Each structure stands twice: as structure tokens, then as C-alpha cells.
Ligand binder design. Structure first.
Ligand SMILES: *[C@@H]1O[C@H](CO)[C@@H](O[C@@H]2O[C@H](CO)[C@@H](O[C@@H]3O[C@H](CO[C@H]4O[C@H](CO)[C@@H](O)[C@H](O)[C@@H]4O)[C@@H](O)[C@H](O[C@H]4O[C@H](CO)[C@@H](O)[C@H](O)[C@@H]4O)[C@@H]3O)[C@H](O)[C@H]2NC(C)=O)[C@H](O)[C@H]1NC(C)=O
Ligand SMILES: *[C@@H]1O[C@H](CO)[C@@H](O[C@@H]2O[C@H](CO)[C@@H](O[C@@H]3O[C@H](CO[C@H]4O[C@H](CO)[C@@H](O)[C@H](O)[C@@H]4O)[C@@H](O)[C@H](O[C@H]4O[C@H](CO)[C@@H](O)[C@H](O)[C@@H]4O)[C@@H]3O)[C@H](O)[C@H]2NC(C)=O)[C@H](O)[C@H]1NC(C)=O
Ligand SMILES: *[C@@H]1O[C@H](CO)[C@@H](O[C@@H]2O[C@H](CO)[C@@H](O[C@@H]3O[C@H](CO[C@H]4O[C@H](CO)[C@@H](O)[C@H](O)[C@@H]4O)[C@@H](O)[C@H](O[C@H]4O[C@H](CO)[C@@H](O)[C@H](O)[C@@H]4O)[C@@H]3O)[C@H](O)[C@H]2NC(C)=O)[C@H](O)[C@H]1NC(C)=O
Ligand SMILES: *[C@@H]1O[C@H](CO)[C@@H](O[C@@H]2O[C@H](CO)[C@@H](O[C@@H]3O[C@H](CO[C@H]4O[C@H](CO)[C@@H](O)[C@H](O)[C@@H]4O)[C@@H](O)[C@H](O[C@H]4O[C@H](CO)[C@@H](O)[C@H](O)[C@@H]4O)[C@@H]3O)[C@H](O)[C@H]2NC(C)=O)[C@H](O)[C@H]1NC(C)=O
Ligand SMILES: *[C@@H]1O[C@H](CO)[C@@H](O[C@@H]2O[C@H](CO)[C@@H](O)[C@H](O)[C@H]2NC(C)=O)[C@H](O)[C@H]1NC(C)=O
Ligand SMILES: *[C@@H]1O[C@H](CO)[C@@H](O)[C@H](O)[C@H]1NC(C)=O
Ligand SMILES: *[C@@H]1O[C@H](CO)[C@@H](O)[C@H](O)[C@H]1NC(C)=O
Ligand SMILES: *[C@@H]1O[C@H](CO)[C@@H](O)[C@H](O)[C@H]1NC(C)=O
Ligand SMILES: *[C@@H]1O[C@H](CO)[C@@H](O)[C@H](O)[C@H]1NC(C)=O
Ligand SMILES: *[C@@H]1O[C@H](CO)[C@@H](O)[C@H](O)[C@H]1NC(C)=O
Ligand SMILES: [Cl-]
Ligand SMILES: [Cl-]
Ligand SMILES: [Cl-]
Ligand SMILES: [Cl-]
Ligand SMILES: [Cl-]
Lengths: 337, 337, 337, 337, 337
């Protein structure tokens, strides 16, 4: 009779849990129970190309109705201590593609249960999850990635449990507040579908983001140092061919410098082994400095016999190398845009 | 009647827990319960730019009143074993921006419960928490950071629970004893406010520090080696231009040395990819050594035809390079102070 | 009488667990209980040569019959909450070669129990396991690996429990969907056998894959840089022998470049210490550049006394080195194919 | 009556735990309970300068008297299974400066409870703890460190619990058996005191060690390579000044070699950023090789105009550089001893 | 009467656990209980010189008799579910030198309990343990190590529990199947003894292995590259002394190459700081290349004044350096064999 009477509320709640069976879903043997889900994305911790995964922190909320929990006489929504969730049936929701997830537990287990007079249950969890994201890094670092989060029921088919995004397209919030230092989020989508398996159709909810990488860092730290070394290799062309020590030292040191750039960048670059766009550019620049030293090899071999022809080779090399390298840049960036 | 009678105290405490409901907050259905909080900061373990987080160890204390726990006849404050906290209602306090936190449990769970005759509860926890701190590292290593710790109730709105800093501005202690090897704490602030959400206003407490990085290490290990290499590149100007091997070797080795400095520092520097102030300085010095070798390319090309003009270019380069580099230093440090 | 009557189903299930003993296997003291197993491979997280292990995520399902759990009157398959599995006997199945495995527990423990009227139990678990895989890396990176997963009963012999692959060769699914960036799966096999131990025969199930490594990355990043340095060393042969500084600098810098390639690749290469095929090729190329500099040592020592003989040595070196290196390549790749 | 009668001992122990309250300390409301502590140090796992902590494994024993546990008729000390400790009051002892600690649990929880007829309790735990140790590394690697372990009661003041070292100065054993590869233990001290806090005085026990680092490794691997490069730079002085290519190459390569030593040592050196003694020596040697190349710059500029003065500068440089470097060594080692 | 009657077996087992006290050892107050132990070594995961520990996976079995568990009428050995071990007394066996150990728990806790009619208990556990192994690495990488596993009772003295190796020298199996990529096992020993402590003698079992490292990897990757650089330094002796640029560049580049070998190997070598045999060889080779460049310093200083004496120094250096280096190799390998 009195909502503020704590003794009466204890009697009301104990009546709900008297005879309550946690092993049975609501409306057992009848129509499936519809569970609505909405996510408040706290942050995206990291996106790892080496491990092919990303880490996500979110507020995961589930919304279903259990008529066994309906109470009367109290015109209020009962927010209960999170330890009562162990005494109730909850959906066996799991993330299909997650690798390691947990529920925060400081200072208490980050969980909330809110009851409603008609039997509706609001069930919230603060979850940090690492989900697998297979990344196509052929265009690295100019790549665009699409990482998803799959939500499914572990043991119940669509004859028992159905999923939907509560609130429509606005079910997932906090996407605009995500601050990824390396990526920029382009779009996010919410997909609801049933997936047919051996044991029957299973409810499925999908949340996906499209990530576009920021290339500003790689231009300054990776492409620019390699270009300048390639430019520096062409200095040998304008050096007089009689100076054997100067042009050989200049040619071989640029090759030495190029290898140091290549070898040390591999430590900073992702450890995943296969061909990438950045590797094609770095190897392309190494070929040019390799051919620049070979150019002087031909000139130095024929400088004594045919000075006019040796000088002619050197003069043309002052144009072919800048033109071919610029032509190589044109085709490379057009193919990677 | 006798405070020292252990049997009587057991009877008194068991009476308090007889009929006690942990699922209901104090004054359920009535005015919100006010929870006072104070923090004793044990230490700040680390501040990570790569992970964008910091680790904090603290004594977290909560102070509320529960009239269900009021006892009479014992004019003493009852300090109970920490296992009794599981038999009482405690606030569902959590840290909004934490990534991984735990309560120490050696040799026992680091927790204390103290009861008072009027029903007041003192609840302490020793917590190590890793909290996310988004760092703006454009001015790295001359950056100044502001890392916070957000405290909020997980399931209760301001109609049920209210937060305040117990003791005012002196609620948080131990800040002056924090010893960060890399940072110096400038100020800390305590903020109390209510944040409006979809489900209503939520109590919020904020503790923030301002961190100023120490630049002494970077001057000796990063800026000084790069400056001296740039100074060493200008030695080629005073070397006679006829010595083709000497000036070419000197010019190309400084470029080789500069790349080794750049590549190896990236391992020591933070792994976060984007433009930083230190990167601008390192790349700026590489341009100067790159142009120093290009300067001899022009001189060596025209030394035979116009010795006077080639010598004139060399003479002016002994002034422009020191002046431009000093001018570059002036604008760089003024823009980063 | 009514399948949709939740109260009747609770009575039926409680009758099954009344007097049920979890310490005794089904048909205790009689014929062994046959447990059928099928695996749905979610993914293969990683394959580590340094740790000699691979990480696997899968849906592990076990299928046995317990006549103590037979129920009548309900013509339906009872899917129960996963917390009921603690109240039933389950096989003590473990993975023989695993190093670290766990069952996912977000948002609930990833586990399902399904009962059938005849007493059959379907028991599913989502398990991430790290299994030891001893790899023969003599042919690295042209190696082919065979990693297995051994399934055995911990405490029961074949007189008590028997294993079989439920569904035959189609028991394990999802192998075709595995996407390993570095490896390609060639075949998988299912083996069932009994292994005789000291305490008797034990049931055993084996799932093995054959992995073939992708060599495309190593050709571009490891073999190609080393070959080009070896080619660049032969440039000294066509350089005139009077230029002492040029040929010595060219010869010694290629050795310097080769060491930098060798030393830095070790960081990228697996940390396991022993002889590998890639090490033989890298050391072979170092011998050629080492002998190239020794070739000029002989020429420079006898150029003054016998110019004709010194020139003859240089002329033959322009053929022997390309021929021997090509001959070395022919034998190397034939032995490693 | 019969000590060997297992049934009688069960009756005696069950009588002690009948009515026993774990929430109340012994002599509740009366004099404080004195807890004696002794530690058997198993090992010191590691000492980390990067993390500013050390790892310790020890046998932690606590010794107090509880008259509620007094028994008569059995003239024996009852060693009970470690699961009985959960049914008894134990001190809330914790380590003030620990970062991560645990109690070993294989094959059982490493814990022992021994009862005595007068009510005395012996309570042992095998604990591995990581304790914070703030290290002053200005004199690194010639530093001497003092790492402590603070022991305190979490919730009880000196009015309730008092601490003392059981056995006096011999309370802590196993210090002489500690084998640190990098450090040598000089002394250890045991301190007992009461620390006044806001809520009153708290018992405190302190165990501290003084660690002296071993410098033999750094002499061979760090100081010796840098000294020899500095010695090698002076070779240019005895080289004839007409050889422009030789002295420039020798001077610039020593600078290149010095940077490689500096950059690569940072990976092996601790990652903590600030000035250290080793950094001063490495930077000092770089200045000498930097000035050695500048010395030839002056000589090469004036060799044509004033050969006598240019030769005079070279002759004096053969003495000033060895003398200044030796003078630099004298002041450096005297200031760091 | 009927072994196959599951109801009768439940009655028999429940009778054993009726009145059973887990806090008391078998034959409490009487003769000590003898516990037999045998180990089936599954594998040795890794041996870490940096952490001074090794990881071991094994089947740990304990064999004792408890007359309280004797049953009659069932002529069979009762294999029970592993959850019954929590209802029985088990020895408090722990590993003295372990650092981190756990019992596998997928799909169940890897544990078995087998009862016998006379009261004998067979108790098995699958344990992965990391045990501390102090390694003497003065002879690294030609070192031979002896790693042990100490087994002891935590709380019981020899008056209560006694240990023995069940099966004699054949108690530990699977040693011959251990496959360490870096080490080869020479011998293993089983030791049983009582260790006298302050509180009395304690039972102790010791299992130790002798490990011999494989040096094949270090010969190819560490010793061979350093030897060839030292050989390459002697090329300067046969180069004509008039070529100042050639011999200086050759001498200083070998020093540069040697430092790169030394610095980069430290990353691959163990991080433990102190003198090792490999460090002596690497530093010895650096002295030879250091003295080789100093040899030309003397020759170049006196070539103009005394060409005959300068040539004489060069001629003798072609013999002393190969002889001293070979003499250095002879003493080094004899002292390290
Ligand atoms: C990252 O990558 C993933 C995987 O490719 C992308 O996920 C896909 O997203 C698209 C939408 O952008 C999904 O397409 C939609 O699927 C809905 C569900 O499909 C189920 O139901 C339909 C029948 O309704 C069945 O045919 C189907 O088999 C499933 O059972 C559909 O309802 C949608 O249909 C709507 O649009 C079509 C036109 O496209 C209309 O004709 C319809 O009337 C209706 O309006 C639609 O087809 C697709 O299913 C998702 N794939 C998966 C595997 O889930 C992410 O979008 C991507 N991320 C980003 C940022 O791009
Ligand atoms: C990775 O490496 C592992 C280990 O080498 C390979 O595993 C082996 O796989 C082969 C099959 O490819 C297995 O061979 C088969 O074993 C079955 C079980 O053996 C038990 O039972 C037989 C009697 O039936 C006993 O003799 C034996 O001792 C065992 O107790 C056999 O039933 C199979 O026999 C079938 O084929 C033979 C011909 O080969 C016929 O004569 C038979 O009639 C019958 O049709 C067969 O012998 C082998 O046992 C596996 N080894 C282990 C240790 O399990 C993986 O295959 C490999 N991975 C890849 C991808 O290659
Ligand atoms: C690593 O660094 C720590 C911190 O600096 C060192 O710890 C200190 O150790 C010294 C001893 O070496 C301690 O000094 C002793 O403290 C005792 C306790 O102090 C309490 O009680 C006294 C009154 O008795 C109060 O004044 C005080 O405020 C405390 O409440 C004292 O009892 C000792 O006094 C004894 O010596 C003095 C002379 O020194 C005599 O006059 C006295 O009569 C008596 O005999 C003494 O003062 C010091 O307290 C420790 N500091 C801390 C913070 O605990 C470690 O020693 C160091 N490690 C190594 C290896 O050097
Ligand atoms: C790695 O390093 C460890 C530590 O050094 C080695 O462990 C030692 O192994 C040897 C055997 O190889 C052990 O020696 C034996 O110890 C037994 C137990 O000693 C207890 O009991 C005896 C009395 O019986 C007491 O004197 C002693 O103090 C102990 O209380 C002895 O019973 C053995 O005696 C047998 O041999 C001797 C001759 O050597 C005969 O005279 C006896 O009659 C009898 O037959 C023997 O002394 C030694 O105890 C171990 N040390 C430790 C600390 O446990 C490992 O062997 C090594 N690993 C490898 C692979 O080498
Ligand atoms: C029990 O705790 C209360 C609260 O800490 C103590 O009350 C304080 O008493 C001091 C004086 O001793 C006052 O200065 C404070 O203002 C009081 N605080 C409050 C909230 O009342 C009380 O003294 C303690 N009881 C005992 C026996 O120590
Ligand atoms: C509060 O509810 C309890 C339980 O129904 C009841 O006994 C009590 O009388 C109520 N309070 C009042 C003031 O009536
Ligand atoms: C202590 O309290 C108990 C419980 O109220 C009571 O039975 C006992 O008599 C008290 N002690 C004394 C000495 O009265
Ligand atoms: C449902 O089953 C319960 C338990 O057997 C029974 O008491 C109840 O009457 C059943 N429902 C109906 C509508 O009969
Ligand atoms: C052992 O103690 C029990 C409990 O006190 C008692 O019933 C039994 O008789 C004792 N044993 C003997 C031989 O008296
Ligand atoms: C099996 O044992 C139970 C318990 O002792 C007994 O009641 C039952 O009669 C036995 N079975 C048969 C067939 O006698
Ligand atoms: Cl957490
Ligand atoms: Cl802890
Ligand atoms: Cl998980
Ligand atoms: Cl452990
Ligand atoms: Cl495990």
C-alpha cells in the first residue's frame, strides 16, 4: 500500500522470487521472448593489425519482459542491487567474434537490474571486449577497414528467443565520440537477421564500423625519407666521372642508407608477413638506387675507351632517372587512391 | 550493557542483520542517500602515451548512513571483519573511464567496514586502476596533459543516490607525495556535478590532475645529437672543393648518421602514429643535411667552368646555413613554448 | 500433460534431479558410455614458431545418453539454462596437448545443455585453446607443418567411457573458413583410437591440420635484398684496379650492408635458435661478398709486379662469381622444394 | 581423553567453532591483540628499474593468541587443513607498497593453520609480491638502492591490533641466500613503529634491503667500446694532413660509430627517461669525437696559407686530446665513487 | 550386493562421507601417513635465461591410504567425479621453487580421484608450473645447466606425513620424450630426503635434470660473422701503404661493422647483465680490429722518413695478427671445453 515502506517492498520482491525457476525462459513452451538491445559505446581502446583485432568498451543493455516478475501495488520502477541478477533468468547473449571479454567489477560488478510493474526487465552490463577483425592490408597504409561485432544467442533458436535493436537506428550511441588516433570512423550500421544453422535459425545482431586510416604520419616518416635518398642518389650523375672514389662512395652509401631505412621500418611497421603497398614503394626506391650505382659501373668501364659515349650515358641518366621515378610515383599513387 | 562483552556484541550485530535486505538502498522510496567520498592517493604507477592511460593506486572511502544498521547500548565504533561487507548494501560506485581495476587481496581483501551507533557506515577499498587519458601529443615532448578520474553510480539516479566530496577540497590527499619520474604535477581539482542522461540525471565526481613533462632528458638524448650532426655537415663548406672524395663522403655520411638517429629514436619514442613536435625538428635537421650535400653538387658541377662563381657559392653557404638553422631554431622554440 | 505449462515442466525437471548423483557415470558398473563429439572451428587465432603453439577457438559439443535424465509426457527437447550443467554428470574431457585454454563467459558462460526425452544430453562449450605444436623449421620459410589437437578422457578408461566422432568425417566443420595470413591449410584428418597406458586403454580423438607457409613475403623482404647486394659486389670487378679507394670502399660497404641485413632480420625472424634454410642462404651470400673483397686483395697485391696476371684474375672473376652464385642458387632451391 | 582418538578430536574442534564469531577480533573491546610476524625470504625474483619495483617470494607467518580457540585434554599442537582458516578470525595484514601480490595455490592454497592449547594461532602464507621501489638512478650504473616492504593493518588501529617482529632481529631469515645476478645485498633492517593517521595511530613493520649494483658488465659492454672509439679518433692527428679523404672518412666514421653505440645502448639501457651518469659519459665521448673532426676542419682550411701554423695545431692536438680525455675521466670517476 | 546397482553404490559412498572430517589427516595422532608420488612429464615448455626459470607440464599423482574411506561389498575400484576431491583430505603438497603454477580446467578441472576397497586413494592433477632455475652463464653458450623441482609438505612435518617416490627410479616418466629445441637432456635423478627446519624435519622429494645447450646455432650466427670480419681487417696489410684513403676506410669500416655485430647481438642474446664467454670472444675480436687500424697509424706516420722500417712493420703484421688470433682461438676454446 505504501511505496516508501521498505518492509512491504521486501515482501513484494520475495513473492516474485518464490517458486521462480531460472532454468526456464519466459513464456516457456510458447511464443519466443523478444529481447531488445542497445549499446552505449564508451570508447574503442585500440585497433591492432598484428593481432587482427580491436578492443571495445561499451554499456550493453538488454530489454525483455518476464510476466513471472510482474508485481502490483507499487507504482514505481524497482532498481535492485546487482546481486539479484543471479536469481533471475537472463538471455544467454554472447559475442560471436570476440576473443577476450570481461565485465568490470570495481567497486562492484558493473551490472544493473531494473524491474517494471508489467514484468519488464532492464539488464545492463559494462563490457570490455576484444573482437577479431580480419583486415585486408594490401593497400596499407592507405587501407580502409570494416570491423564488426556479432551478437547471437548461444543455446536458443528463433523459436525461443528473438533479437531486435531497441530504438531502431539510434540503438547504438557514442560512435561520434570515439577518438581513434590512427583511424577515422566513416559510418556505422545496424543489421538484424536470422542465420540458419544445423540446429535451426539463430537470432543475430550486427554492429559494424568503417575505419579510414590517417596517412599523414606515414608521409612524413616513411615516404619522405625514402624519396630524399632516391633524389640524393642522382647527385652522382652531375659529379665528374673521373672521381671514382666520390661517385662509388656516394652510390654505395645511398644503398646502405636505403637498407637501414627498410630494415628499421619493419620494426615500426606491422609484424604481419605479406605484401603491402608500403613495401612495394620501399622496394621500388631500392631498385632505383641500385640502378644508379649500376649506371656508373657502365660509365666507369667505358670512360677510357669512349669518353664521348660514356659522357653521353651520364647526360641521359640525368633525365631518365627523374622521369622514371616521377612516372613510377604517378602510377603508384593512382593505383592506390 | 558491557561493551567489552563479546557475546553481547555478537547478539547486537546479529540483530542488525536479522531481516536486513541487501537489495534495497537505505531510505528506499524516500529521499536519496548521500554518499561522501574521499581518496588517499597511494601513488601513480605509470603514464603511458602508447596506451593513452595511467595507472593509479588509492584508498577509496565511501561514507553513507543506513538507519537499518543503527544500534544502541554500545558507545563504540564497531570495526568489523571485511567479510561482513558482503552482508550489507554498498553503493554501486564505478569509475567511468577506467580500463582495468582491481581490489588488492593479500593477505586479505583490502577492505574495511566501520559501523557507528547512528547507522553511519565507513567503507574503504584499496584499488589499483588503469584509467584512460586521451593525450594531445602535438607538442611532444613539450606537452602538458590533463588526466581525470570520473566517479559515477552505475544504476542509481540522483533520485536515489547523491555524491559529494567529503571534506571539501581536502577530500583527496597524497597528491603532493606523487613522484612521477617523467611528469610533474601542477594542480589537481575536485568537481561535483550531475550529468543528464536518457534515464535521468546521474551523480558524478571528477578528480583531475595537470601533468607537465620534463624535457631535460630529450634535450640531451634527442635534440643535442641531431644539432651536432647538422653542425658537422657545414664542415664541408670550409673543405677545399677540389677534394671530391672528402666532401662527398662527409656529406653522405652525415645523411647516413641522421637516418640512424631518426630510425633508432622511433623505437624509444612513443609508438602512436601521428605528427609530433619532435618529428618536425628531426625532419627539419634532415633537410639541412640534405641541402648541404646538394650544395656541393652545384659547386662540383661548375667548379671547372667558373671557379670564381663556384667559390662564391661556397663562401655564401658558410653563412646562410648557420643563419637559416639558427632562424629555424628561433621560430621552432617560440612556437613550442 | 501440457507442454506449455511452465509449472509442470519445473516439476518434471526437479524429479530428474531428485536423487541424481553427479559422482557416478551413466550406466555405472555396466557397459561404457559412448560420447560423440563434433567441433565447429570458429577461427585459428595465431600460429607461433617462437612459442611452438597455435591458438584455436571452437564450439566443442559432446553427445551422450543418461537414462537417469529420461522424462516422459513432454514431447519437446528441453533447452535449459547453462547453470544446470553444474547439477549433472559431464565427461571429464580434456585436451592432451593444450597449454592454456578457457571457456568464454560474457555475457554468460558460453555453455548450453539440451535434454531429450530418451535421456540424451547435448553439451556445448565455446573454448579458446592454445595447443602445443612442435614445428620442424629446418626448411623455414619453405616449411610445411602438421598441428594436431588431442582429445582424451582424464580419469576414465575404455571400460567406462568411449569416444567417437559424431557425424563421421563431417564431425569437424569450419575448416574451410579458416583465414591464416601466413599459412594455407592443405588437409585435415579425424582419427579415433585407443591408447594403452599403465592403468589401461584410454579413448583418444585426434584432429590435425597440415599448414603450408606462404613464401611471397620472404622473397620480397629477405631473399631479394640479399641477392641485390651480392650483385652489387661484383661491380668492383669492372672498376679499374688502379682506383684503390673506390674498390675497397665498394667491397667493404657491401659487407657492412650485408651484416646490417643479417642482424636486423634476426629481430623479424623467429627467435628459436637453430639452423634454418633462410640462415644458410643469408650466410651463403655473406661468403660471396667476403670473397669478392678478398679477390681485390690478391689483385692489388700483384698489380705492380704482374699487371697482366692481375688483370687476368680480374677478368675471370667477372664470370666465376656470377656462375658460382647462380650454381649456388640452383642447388639451394632444388634442395628446398 | 585419548589424543589418538580421531572422533574425540573432531568433537573438540567443533566445540571451538560452535558460537565462534569471525567478525570480532580476539579480546574485542579490551586490550589490543599482539600479532607477531616473521618472514622466511624464499627469493627475490627481479629488480626492475623501468617499472621501479621488485618481486619477492616469502613465507609470511603471523602469531597471535585467541582465547576463544583454547582447548583442553589434548596435549598436542593441532595442525589443521588450510580450509579451516576461512572459519577463523585472521589479522587484516596488507603490504602498503605492494603493486601485485598473490598466494600460491598448487596443489592446494599455500597456507597453514596450527592451534595450541592456550589458544595461540600460527598462520603461514607463501606469498609472491611485487613491491614498488623508487630508485634514484642519477648515479646509474654506479647506484645504490634501498627497497623496503611496509606491513600494516588495513582497518584496525593500535587500540585494536599491535605488531611486532617475532624473534627480534632474527625474525626475517633467508636474506643471506638471496642470489641477485645484478645486485649484491649489503644490509637489511627491521623497523617497528606506529604511524599517526587521520583515524589514529596504525601499527607498522618495515623490512628494507640495501642493494649495490654490479658494474663489471657495464665496464666491458658500455664504457670500454666508447673509450676505444675515442682513442681511435685521435689516429687522425698522426695521419698526414694532405690526405683529405683519409682523415675526413676516419673522423666522420668514428662519429657514425659513436651514434650507433649510443642509439643501440638505449634499447639495452633502462627505458626511464631522465639524466643518468652513463648518459653523461656517453655524451662526453661524443663531444670529443665531434671536436676531433672539427680540429681537422681548422687544419684543412689553413694548410695552404700557413703550413707551419696548420702543422702546429695538429702537433698540439696529439697531446691536448689525450690529456683532456684523461682529465675528463679523472673528474668523472671521482664524482661517481 | 550388486556392483552394477547405482543406487547401492550411492549409499556406499555417502556412508564413507558421513562423519568424515577433512581437517584431520589419516591416522591422526598416530604414525605418519606415507604418500607415494609419481610424475608423468608431458613436456618442458621453455627454458628462460633472462627470467632464470623453466616451464613444465606434468601429470602429478599422489598415492596414500585413508582407512576412513574403506568400503566393503564392492569388488571394484571406484573412479569418482573430480568434484568429490573437495570433500576429502588431500596432502598439502606444494613445489618449493615454483614461481607460477596452475591446474588446467578445460573442459573440467584436470583432476581424478580413484578409491580402493582398502581405503587407498589415487589423486591425479595436470599441472603447468614455472620453476626457478638459477643458471650459471659464465660459459654461455657452452654452458650446462641443472634445473630441479622440489616437492615438500607445507604444514606437516615427518611426524605426520612422509614422502616417497612410488615405483623407485621409474616414478618419473616421459623424460625421454622431452623435445627442447635449444637444450638436450643428459640425465635426470630422483632424490628423497628429510630437511631439518626450525619447526622440525620436513619430507622432501627432488627431481632434477641436466641440460646441455646446443652450440650449432651460435657458431653460424655469432662466432662465424665475427671471425670473418677479423680476417677481413688483415686485408689492409697487403694493401700498399701509399693508399691512405683505402686502408683507413677499410680499417675504420671493419670497426664500424664489428660494433654493429656487437650491439645487435645484445638484443638477441639474453638480457641478464654480467660477463659471459660469448662476450669475451666478441670483445677479443674488437681488440684485434682496433689494433689493426692502429698498426697503419704507426706505418703511415713513419712511411715518409723510414720507408724500409715502415714496410718492415707491415710485413711482420701479416704474420703476427693471424698467429695471435689463432693463438687466441686456441686458448679460448681449450678454456671453454
Ligand atoms: C562490413 O561488412 C559487413 C558484411 O559484408 C556488412 O554487413 C552487411 O550490411 C548490409 C547492409 O549495409 C546487409 O544487407 C542487409 O541485410 C538485411 C538482413 O538480411 C537478412 O534478411 C534478408 C531479407 O530481409 C535476407 O535476404 C538475408 O539473407 C538475411 O537473412 C536485409 O534486410 C537488408 O535488405 C534491405 O536492403 C535491400 C537492398 O540492399 C532491400 O532490397 C530490402 O528490401 C531491405 O530494405 C540488406 O540486404 C548485409 O546483410 C550485411 N552482411 C552481413 C553478413 O551481416 C557491413 O555493412 C559492413 N560495414 C560497413 C560500415 O559497410
Ligand atoms: C599429423 O601427424 C599425425 C601423427 O603422425 C597424423 O596422425 C596419423 O594419421 C593416420 C591417418 O592419416 C593414422 O593412421 C590411422 O590410424 C587409425 C587408428 O589406429 C589405431 O587402430 C589401428 C587398428 O585399426 C591400430 O593398428 C593402431 O595402432 C591404433 O590403435 C587406423 O584405424 C587407420 O587404419 C586405416 O588405414 C589403414 C591403412 O593406412 C588400413 O590398413 C586400415 O584397415 C584402416 O582403413 C590408420 O592406420 C595414425 O594413427 C595417426 N597417428 C596418430 C599418432 O594418431 C596426422 O594424419 C598428420 N596430419 C596430417 C594432416 O597429415
Ligand atoms: C631505507 O630507507 C628507510 C627510510 O629512510 C630506512 O628506514 C629507517 O631506518 C631507521 C633505522 O636504520 C629508523 O630509525 C629508527 O626508527 C625507530 C622507530 O621510530 C619510531 O619510534 C621513535 C621513538 O622510538 C620515534 O621517534 C619515531 O618518530 C617513530 O615513531 C626508532 O625507535 C629508532 O630509534 C633508535 O635509534 C635511535 C638513534 O638512531 C636512538 O636514539 C633510539 O633510542 C633507538 O635506539 C630509530 O630512530 C627509521 O625510522 C626508518 N625510517 C622509516 C621511514 O621507517 C631504512 O633503514 C633504509 N634501509 C637501509 C638498508 O638503510
Ligand atoms: C642438481 O643439483 C642437485 C643439488 O646439488 C643435485 O642433487 C643432489 O643429488 C645427489 C645424488 O646425485 C644427492 O646425494 C644423495 O642424497 C641422498 C639423500 O641425502 C639425505 O640422506 C643422507 C643419508 O642417507 C644424508 O647424509 C643427507 O644429509 C640427506 O639427509 C643420499 O641418501 C644419497 O646417499 C647415497 O649415495 C652415497 C654416495 O654418494 C652413499 O654413501 C649412500 O649410502 C647412498 O647410497 C646421496 O648422498 C644430493 O643429496 C642431492 N642434493 C640435494 C640438495 O638434494 C642433483 O643431482 C643435480 N642434478 C644432476 C642431474 O646432476
Ligand atoms: C566514532 O567515530 C566518530 C566519527 O569519526 C567520532 O566522532 C568524532 O569525534 C571527534 C572527537 O573525538 C570529533 O572531533 C569529530 O567531529 C566527531 N565526528 C563525528 C562525525 O561525530 C567518535 O568520537 C568515535 N567514537 C570513539 C569512541 O572514538
Ligand atoms: C510495511 O509492510 C509490512 C509488510 O507487509 C507490514 O507488516 C507493515 O505494517 C507495513 N508498514 C506499515 C506502517 O503498515
Ligand atoms: C554477555 O552477553 C550475553 C548475550 O547478551 C549474555 O548472555 C551474557 O550474560 C553477557 N555477559 C555477562 C557477564 O553478563
Ligand atoms: C501445471 O502444472 C502444475 C504442476 O504439475 C499443476 O499444479 C497445474 O495445475 C498445471 N496447470 C494447469 C492449468 O493444470
Ligand atoms: C572417541 O571419541 C568419541 C567422541 O567423544 C567417543 O564417542 C568415543 O567413544 C571415543 N573412543 C573411544 C575408544 O572411547
Ligand atoms: C540397489 O540399492 C538400493 C540401495 O541399497 C536398494 O534399495 C535397491 O533395492 C537395490 N537394487 C535392487 C535391484 O535390489
Ligand atoms: Cl575491471
Ligand atoms: Cl593484489
Ligand atoms: Cl572471455
Ligand atoms: Cl601459483
Ligand atoms: Cl588451462
Amino acid at each position: 500500500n505504501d511505496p516508501g515502506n521498505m518492509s512491504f517492498v521486501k515482501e513484494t520482491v520475495d513473492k516474485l522470487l518464490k517458486g521462480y525457476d531460472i532454468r526456464l525462459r519466459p513464456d516457456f513452451g510458447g511464443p519466443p521472448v523478444c529481447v531488445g538491445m542497445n549499446i552505449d559505446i564508451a570508447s574503442i581502446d585500440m585497433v591492432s593489425e598484428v593481432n587482427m583485432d580491436y578492443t571495445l568498451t561499451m554499456y550493453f543493455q538488454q530489454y525483455w519482459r518476464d510476466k513471472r516478475l510482474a508485481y502490483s501495488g507499487i507504482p514505481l520502477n524497482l532498481t535492485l542491487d546487482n546481486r539479484v541478477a543471479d536469481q533471475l533468468w537472463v538471455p544467454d547473449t554472447y559475442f560471436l567474434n570476440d576473443k577476450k571479454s570481461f565485465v568490470h567489477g570495481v567497486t562492484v560488478k558493473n551490472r544493473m537490474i531494473r524491474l517494471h510493474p508489467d514484468g519488464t526487465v532492464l539488464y545492463g552490463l559494462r563490457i570490455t571486449t576484444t573482437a577479431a577483425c580480419m583486415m585486408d592490408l594490401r593497400r596499407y597504409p592507405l587501407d580502409e577497414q570494416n570491423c564488426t561485432l556479432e551478437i547471437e544467442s548461444y543455446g536458443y533458436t528463433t523459436d525461443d528467443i528473438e533479437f531486435y535493436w531497441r530504438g531502431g537506428d539510434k540503438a547504438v550511441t557514442g560512435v561520434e565520440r570515439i577518438e581513434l588516433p590512427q583511424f577515422s570512423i566513416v559510418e556505422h550500421r545496424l543489421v538484424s537477421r536470422n542465420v540458419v544453422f544445423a540446429t535451426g535459425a539463430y537470432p543475430r545482431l550486427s554492429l559494424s564500423f568503417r575505419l579510414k586510416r590517417n596517412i599523414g604520419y606515414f608521409i612524413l616518416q616513411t615516404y619522405m625519407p625514402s624519396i630524399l635518398i632516391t633524389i640524393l642518389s642522382w647527385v652522382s650523375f652531375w659529379i665528374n666521372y673521373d672521381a671514382s672514389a666520390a661517385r662509388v662512395a656516394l652510390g654505395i652509401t645511398t644503398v646502405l642508407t636505403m637498407t637501414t631505412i627498410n630494415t628499421h621500418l619493419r620494426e615500426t611497421l606491422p609484424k604481419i608477413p605479406y605484401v603491402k603497398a608500403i613495401d612495394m614503394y620501399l622496394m621500388g626506391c631500392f631498385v632505383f638506387v641500385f640502378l644508379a650505382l649500376l649506371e656508373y659501373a657502365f660509365v666507369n668501364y667505358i670512360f677510357f675507351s669512349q669518353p664521348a659515349r660514356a659522357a653521353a650515358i651520364d647526360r641521359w641518366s640525368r633525365i631518365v632517372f627523374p622521369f622514371t621515378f616521377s612516372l613510377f610515383n604517378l602510377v603508384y599513387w593512382l593505383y592506390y587512391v
